[PDB]
Amino acid sequence: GKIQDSLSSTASALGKLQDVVNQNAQALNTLVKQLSSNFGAISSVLNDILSRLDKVEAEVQIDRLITGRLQSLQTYVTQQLIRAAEIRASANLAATKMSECVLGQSKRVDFCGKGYHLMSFPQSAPHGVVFLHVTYVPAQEKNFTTAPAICHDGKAHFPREGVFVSNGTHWFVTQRNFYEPQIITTDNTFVSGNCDVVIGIVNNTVYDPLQPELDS
Amino acid sequence: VDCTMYICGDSTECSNLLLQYGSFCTQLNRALTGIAVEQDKNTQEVFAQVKQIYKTPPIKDFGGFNFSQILPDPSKPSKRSFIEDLLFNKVTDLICAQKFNGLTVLPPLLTDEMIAQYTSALLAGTITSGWTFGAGAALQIPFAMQMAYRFNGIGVTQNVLYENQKLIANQFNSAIGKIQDSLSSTASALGKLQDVVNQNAQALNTLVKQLSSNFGAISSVLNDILSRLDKVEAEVQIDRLITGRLQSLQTYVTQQLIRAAEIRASANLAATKMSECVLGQSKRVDFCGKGYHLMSFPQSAPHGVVFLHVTYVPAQEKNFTTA
Amino acid sequence: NFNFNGLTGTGVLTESNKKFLPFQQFGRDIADTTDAVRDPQTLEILDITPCSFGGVSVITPGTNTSNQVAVLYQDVNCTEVNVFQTRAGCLIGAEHVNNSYECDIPIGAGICASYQTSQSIIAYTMSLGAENSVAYSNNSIAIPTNFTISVTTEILPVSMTKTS
Amino acid sequence: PLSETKCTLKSFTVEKGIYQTSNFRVQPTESIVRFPNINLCPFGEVFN
Numbered sequence: 012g013k014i015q016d017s018l019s020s021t022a023s024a025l026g027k028l029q030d031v032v033n034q035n036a037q038a039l040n041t042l043v044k045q046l047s048s049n050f051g052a053i054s055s056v057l058n059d060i061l062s063r064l065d066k067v068e069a070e071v072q073i074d075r076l077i078t079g080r081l082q083s084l085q086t087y088v089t090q091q092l093i094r095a096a097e098i099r100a101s102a103n104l105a106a107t108k109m110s111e112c113v114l115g116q117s118k119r120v121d122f123c124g125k126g127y128h129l130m131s132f133p134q135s136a137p138h139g140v141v142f143l144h145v146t147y148v149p150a151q152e153k154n155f156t157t158a159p160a161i162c163h164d165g166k167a168h169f170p171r172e173g174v175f176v177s178n179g180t181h182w183f184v185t186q187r188n189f190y191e192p193q194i195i196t197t198d199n200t201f202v203s204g205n206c207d208v209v210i211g212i213v214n215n216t217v218y219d220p221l222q223p224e225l226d227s
Numbered sequence: 228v229d230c231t232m233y234i235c236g237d238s239t240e241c242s243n244l245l246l247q248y249g250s251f252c253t254q255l256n257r258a259l260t261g262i263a264v265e266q267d268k269n270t271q272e273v274f275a276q277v278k279q280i281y282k283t284p285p286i287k288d289f290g291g292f293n294f295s296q297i298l299p300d301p302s303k304p305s306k307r308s309f310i311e312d313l314l315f316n317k318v319t320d321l322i323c324a325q326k327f328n329g330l331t332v333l334p335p336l337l338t339d340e341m342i343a344q345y346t347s348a349l350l351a352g353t354i355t356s357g358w359t360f361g362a363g364a365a366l367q368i369p370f371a372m373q374m375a376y377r378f379n380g381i382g383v384t385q386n387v388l389y390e391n392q393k394l395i396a397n398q399f400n401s402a403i404g405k406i407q408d409s410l411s412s413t414a415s416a417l418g419k420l421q422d423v424v425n426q427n428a429q430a431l432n433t434l435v436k437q438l439s440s441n442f443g444a445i446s447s448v449l450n451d452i453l454s455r456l457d458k459v460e461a462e463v464q465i466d467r468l469i470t471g472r473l474q475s476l477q478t479y480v481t482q483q484l485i486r487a488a489e490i491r492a493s494a495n496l497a498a499t500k501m502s503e504c505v506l507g508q509s510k511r512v513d514f515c516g517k518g519y520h521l522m523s524f525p526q527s528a529p530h531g532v533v534f535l536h537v538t539y540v541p542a543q544e545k546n547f548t549t550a
Numbered sequence: 551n552f553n554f555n556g557l558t559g560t561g562v563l564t565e566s567n568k569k570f571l572p573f574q575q576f577g578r579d580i581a582d583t584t585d586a587v588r589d590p591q592t593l594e595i596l597d598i599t600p601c602s603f604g605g606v607s608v609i610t611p612g613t614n615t616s617n618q619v620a621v622l623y624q625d626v627n628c629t630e631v632n633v634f635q636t637r638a639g640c641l642i643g644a645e646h647v648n649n650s651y652e653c654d655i656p657i658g659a660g661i662c663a664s665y666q667t668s669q670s671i672i673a674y675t676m677s678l679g680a681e682n683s684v685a686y687s688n689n690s691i692a693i694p695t696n697f698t699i700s701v702t703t704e705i706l707p708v709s710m711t712k713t714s
Numbered sequence: 715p716l717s718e719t720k721c722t723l724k725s726f727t728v729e730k731g732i733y734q735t736s737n738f739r740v741q742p743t744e745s746i747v748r749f750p751n752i753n754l755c756p757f758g759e760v761f762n
């Protein structure tokens with residue numbers, strides 16, 4: 012709903028498109044005005060040079076018309092080629108986003124826009140395309156004491172995915188991009204090395220799923 | 228460039244003739260402004276992707292990694308990391324000569340000191356906050372617990388770093404050191420930048436020297452044609468100057484357009500790296516430079532940017548029978 | 551607008567420390583353009599220089615807001631013209647502000663102008679970003695408890711109007 | 715210096731942002747003709 016309010020009053024967000032349409036009609040205009048310029052010849056009307064003079068003179072003048080206009084094309088043309096490539100690269104980027112963002116999920120960061128990317132919805136626009144990027148942005152944070160490792164018996168325990176945290180007493184392992192604390196058991200943690208090497212390992216007890224299951 | 232002046236110096240006589248070519252004079256400014264505008268858009272896209280300016284904490288404990296090399300130097304008047312000074316010395320009259328004839332060098336919107344604040348921010352958040360500052364509010368995370376992730380990114384289980392940390396510290400630091408001499412002892416590393424700056428100053432020289440060419444006219448001084456000859460005839464002469472010079476601008480302008488379109492492509496490559504490589508961790512093989520990529524450190528350089536890619540390259544092999 | 555021994559030119563003649571060889575006449579520069587000259591009647595080494603030149607630039611809020619404008623003379627010293635001297639040139643009609651806000655109308659070299667305060671166009675050193683300092687300690691981590699899902703429009707050209 | 719912007723913009727509504735309009739060329743105050751120190755025609759040698 013916010014998108015439609017933005018567009019309702021936003022002329023600028025389409026500036027990229029509106030500029031492209033402009034710049035063409037601009038050079039198109041200027042291309043036309045160049046038909047009114049003398050270019051040094053006695054007039055910018057083709058015939059009015061003729062009927063004024065006997066043609067063996069007009070052959071001279073019409074040069075300065077042709078030499079002028081022919082140039083003004085090659086200016087305009089060479090523009091378009093350059094401008095075409097500018098769109099060309101933009102079109103390649105659109106194909107890349109259309110391919111990767113919409114048809115996939117882009118692991119690339121900030122290629123589909125700020126935040127982790129979920130999906131995109133393309134929308135046509137005159138001489139262009141408009142993606143609606145649906146991105147996952149985290150919000151509320153809480154300062155946590157953390158440790159890279161946890162001793163148990165002298166073995167070291169590291170999280171499979173996520174990190175050991177605590178709110179100051181009970182050590183919890185949680186996934187990284189969302190706060191979802193879970194008690195620390197072997198299914199959370201794998202064993203490597205021992206307690207000497209790690210810098211920052213703390214003293215704790217990693218609960219065991221299996222041990223209670225025995226006791227009967 | 229001032230089209231009316233560059234073509235016709237201080238002469239209404241020539242200036243009136245220029246009106247008969249119409250919008251050439253104006254459309255050149257419209258052309259160059261399009262360049263000049265997006266240049267500060269390039270520098271905008273690349274460097275400032277970050278909402279806030281982060282700054283490093285007062286005290287540096289990263290687990291042994293020494294960033295005093297790459298972090299802003301608190302004792303310089305313009306705060307720029309020790310490395311960046313090596314760069315600004317390598318890269319480099321043309322100061323007013325061009326500015327005689329209407330060739331002007333406009334100041335880049337962002338002063339170098341500002342560029343060094345961005346590349347401080349991006350580098351301040353990268354160190355403290357991991358990659359999350361590109362996705363939202365920065366999240367302080369222990370740097371040594373950052374590098375446990377960036378190994379999981381490349382498939383090396385984090386238990387390698389928690390055990391090898393001290394070693395990895397030295398390899399990092401000793402790697403940073405050689406970056407100094409890599410820059411310090413050789414001036415060809417910056418050629419890419421150096422080539423850009425030269426080619427710009429190149430064409431300007433050429434564009435200026437075109438003022439001194441006859442182009443078929445009796446002389447290259449616009450007034451001499453007016454001084455020696457009665458106007459009736461001098462009109463035709465000044466054409467060959469104007470036609471020559473006015474063309475000679477379109478040559479220069481077209482070059483800039485083409486050349487800018489290259490930079491425009493290179494700028495996106497940076498903005499792509501800056502976003503993916505610096506702000507995130509790249510899974511694209513050899514996009515961030517040879518090896519598995521861990522993190523990247525942006526560093527500013529004149530009209531350019533320099534990345535320090537910290538990459539993970541395996542070393543010693545042991546033949547194993549496998550199944 | 552000077553003529554020296556038949557050499558004509560228009561510039562700002564100043565004293566200069568560059569030292570000719572005695573027989574010489576014109577100093578020059580990389581562009582072959584006349585740079586230094588020697589006063590014949592009493593030998594002295596005079597520099598030369600361009601006039602102020604630069605472009606005029608009209609900084610304005612939208613004509614929808616105000617009809618007031620602040621003129622920027624680019625790359626000049628403020629003589630030959632409420633005035634303020636900048637890095638980018640001589641600015642006129644915008645009150646300097648020691649405060650620093652977001653860059654709004656980009657001017658040059660960090661100077662960015664905005665309309666708000668009665669009101670007058672101002673000019674100030676652009677603050678790049680708002681400032682933050684992450685609170686960082688080797689055991690300190692901040693894990694988000696909640697999220698948003700934002701939809702950010704992104705817009706790209708694809709094709710342009712075909713012509714022949 | 716404001717009305718020139720409207721002509722450059724070609725729109726009675728000039729939207730926000732900076733516009734290059736014109737150029738100023740400082741004109742020179744006066745001319746220096748500096749021929750060297752000291753000929754003279756021998757009218758003291760002809761007339762006297």
Ligand SMILES: *[C@@H]1O[C@H](CO)[C@@H](O[C@@H]2O[C@H](CO)[C@@H](O)[C@H](O)[C@H]2NC(C)=O)[C@H](O)[C@H]1NC(C)=O
Binds near residue numbers: 178179180181
């Ligand atoms: C940290 O979080 C743990 C997990 O909830 C808290 O432990 C619980 O605290 C509540 C307090 O209302 C008790 O009712 C539960 O019995 C506790 N459970 C366990 C397993 O300890 C702990 O109090 C929290 N500490 C802080 C400082 O926030």
Ligand SMILES: *[C@@H]1O[C@H](CO)[C@@H](O[C@@H]2O[C@H](CO)[C@@H](O)[C@H](O)[C@H]2NC(C)=O)[C@H](O)[C@H]1NC(C)=O
Binds near residue numbers: 212
């Ligand atoms: C965790 O527990 C271990 C013992 O299992 C502690 O190691 C000893 O700590 C005492 C002080 O309480 C020292 O006097 C001993 O010298 C330590 N061990 C040895 C062999 O020197 C450890 O300090 C506790 N804290 C940790 C490591 O998190």
Ligand SMILES: *[C@@H]1O[C@H](CO)[C@@H](O[C@@H]2O[C@H](CO)[C@@H](O)[C@H](O)[C@H]2NC(C)=O)[C@H](O)[C@H]1NC(C)=O
Binds near residue numbers: 287291294295
């Ligand atoms: C990071 O490295 C810099 C130099 O690369 C260290 O600065 C040096 O500190 C020693 C102190 O033992 C001095 O003798 C040197 O003169 C310093 N050199 C420079 C260039 O400043 C700095 O101490 C290191 N810091 C950390 C945390 O590793």
Ligand SMILES: *[C@@H]1O[C@H](CO)[C@@H](O)[C@H](O)[C@H]1NC(C)=O
Binds near residue numbers: 153685
């Ligand atoms: C975390 O601690 C810092 C210390 O300055 C504080 O500014 C911040 O607000 C704390 N986090 C939260 C969510 O309050």
Ligand SMILES: *[C@@H]1O[C@H](CO)[C@@H](O)[C@H](O)[C@H]1NC(C)=O
Binds near residue numbers: 288687688
């Ligand atoms: C973390 O830093 C503090 C300094 O504030 C220090 O006392 C402590 O030993 C450090 N711990 C580790 C694991 O580096």
Ligand SMILES: *[C@@H]1O[C@H](CO)[C@@H](O)[C@H](O)[C@H]1NC(C)=O
Binds near residue numbers: 544545546
């Ligand atoms: C593995 O065997 C091949 C056999 O040619 C040899 O080239 C290679 O060096 C061996 N690897 C090591 C680590 O020695």
Ligand SMILES: *[C@@H]1O[C@H](CO)[C@@H](O)[C@H](O)[C@H]1NC(C)=O
Binds near residue numbers: 614615
């Ligand atoms: C622009 O001006 C028109 C009147 O010409 C007015 O109706 C409109 O509200 C104004 N919009 C803004 C954004 O100032």
Ligand SMILES: *[C@@H]1O[C@H](CO)[C@@H](O)[C@H](O)[C@H]1NC(C)=O
Binds near residue numbers: 626627628
């Ligand atoms: C302007 O001129 C004054 C003295 O006339 C001088 O102190 C100052 O540096 C000059 N500034 C520029 C930018 O030329």
Ligand SMILES: *[C@@H]1O[C@H](CO)[C@@H](O)[C@H](O)[C@H]1NC(C)=O
Binds near residue numbers: 645646647648
């Ligand atoms: C900014 O403060 C200085 C004193 O530090 C003062 O001289 C100057 O006039 C102030 N600027 C403005 C625009 O008031």
